Amino acid sequence: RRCQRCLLPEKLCLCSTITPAQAKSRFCLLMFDTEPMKPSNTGRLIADILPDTVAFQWSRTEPSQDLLDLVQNPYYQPMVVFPASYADEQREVIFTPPAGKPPLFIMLDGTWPEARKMFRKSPYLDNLPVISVDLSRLSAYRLREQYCTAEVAIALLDMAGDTGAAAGLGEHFTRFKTRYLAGKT
């Protein structure tokens, strides 16, 4: 009764509406559980609009070597997307994607206690900059300026100059949330 690709009740299936976009930015979803994707999980909306998004199962002791190879690939400028109130005094915090190299935005995908734990117990992320997100930019896409993973990504895409992809994901996100609420009725 639910479509397996978009996870909505089959009558509200939005798969035919999906139009991918292009962006200089790249996302990496670091997932706490990778359990059978819950419909309310907005992180997966990002990969619908930006199919080059990567996702990794998080692991406290044995991090995947694909993940290590990505976050260490000097082609990207990687950053950890998490609220700056969590970072320690010595941690570099930035407020803009830096200039020059394409950003790799590392999103901590889980509940808040799970994402906090991921933030504190992942040594391969510890020397990366934290990007504090400018959520006021959601207004330019007519979204309410915590915030879910797809809303942060929209702000990040806008912060990087990727306005086509930001608008694309905003429309996709709104479309999902509307149909999700409808199928709840």
Ligand X SMILES: C[S@@+](CC[C@H](N)C(=O)[O-])C[C@H]1O[C@@H](n2cnc3c(N)ncnc32)[C@H](O)[C@@H]1O
Site for Zn ion, rule CB under 5 A: 3, 5-6, 13, 15
List, in sequence order, every residue forming a beta bridge with 109; answer none if it has no partner.
31
Give residue 178's identity as a one-letter amino acid code. T
Partner that binds at residue 5, options a second copy, ligand X, Zn ion, none, CB closer than 5 to 8 Å by kind:
Zn ion
Please tell me whether residue 12 binds a second copy under the rule CB under 8 A.
Answer: yes
Residue whose token pair is 């950003």: 103
C-alpha distance from residue 67 to each of 20, 29, 49, 71 (Å): 24, 10, 21, 6
- In angstroms, give the least distance from the CB of 151 to Zn ion: 21
In this complex, which beta carbon is closest to a second copy, that of residue 29 or of residue 167?
A: 167
Partner that binds at residue 15, options ligand X, Zn ion, a second copy, none, CB closer than 5 to 8 Å by kind:
Zn ion
**8 A C-beta contact, residue 46 and residue 40:** no
From the list 71-79, 87-95, 96-104, 175-183, the region that binds a second copy by CB under 8 A is 175-183
From the list 10-18, 47-55, 65-73, 80-88, the region that binds ligand X by CB under 6 A is 80-88
3-state helix, strand, coil in the chain (%, to 5): 40, 15, 45
From the list 44-52, 96-104, 117-125, 172-180, the region that binds a second copy by CB under 8 A is 172-180
DSSP assignment of 105-121 equals EEEEES-HHHHHHHHHS
For 138-170, give one letter per residue: b (16+ CB within 10 A) or e: beebebeeebebbbbbbbbbbbbebeebbbbbb
Please tell me whether residue 178 binds a second copy under the rule CB under 8 A.
Answer: yes
Q: How far apart are CA 103 and CA 94, in angstroms?
A: 13
Please tell me whether residue 94 binds a second copy under the rule CB under 8 A.
Answer: no
Residues from 19 through 78 that contact ligand X (CB under 6 A): 41-43
Instruction: Catalog residues that contact ligand X under the rule CB under 6 A.
Output: 41-43, 81-83, 107-108, 110, 112, 115, 132-133, 146-149, 152
Instruction: Catalog residues that contact a second copy under the rule CB under 8 A.
Output: 12, 177-179, 181-182, 184-185
